[PDB]
Amino acid sequence: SFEAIFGTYCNKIEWVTFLGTALATAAHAIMFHDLNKMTTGKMLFYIQ
Amino acid sequence: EEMFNNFRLYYGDDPERYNLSFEAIFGTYCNKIEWVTFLGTALATAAHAIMFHDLNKMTTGKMLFYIQ
Q1: Does B19 touch chain A (CB under 8 A)?
Q2: DSSP string covering chain B
């Protein structure tokens, strides 16, 4: 005769995302694609 | 049906809000006691079985034998 012993997994969490938070109004989240390949990224500001 | 209900209810009818599962298997054993008949034993050829309905009227344990 054979019937095993059970245990309950849970799968209820909160599915928060960057764009559903209010920090995506602090920065616009640019998906680059070779950021592992990149050395540096600079902005140039020409200012009079 | 019992097996599909093990998959349906004993996993969880909703795969969300929980997931029922098992970890440890469980195999045990519950033997059935061997039916032994008195009247089907080798003991029964020592006996002459006679069964009554009730024993109230013919109570006195005299038994005559008219022996030729």
Answers
A1: yes
A2: -HHHHHHHTTT-SSSSS-EEEEEE--B---PPPPP--STTSGGGGG------S--SSS----------
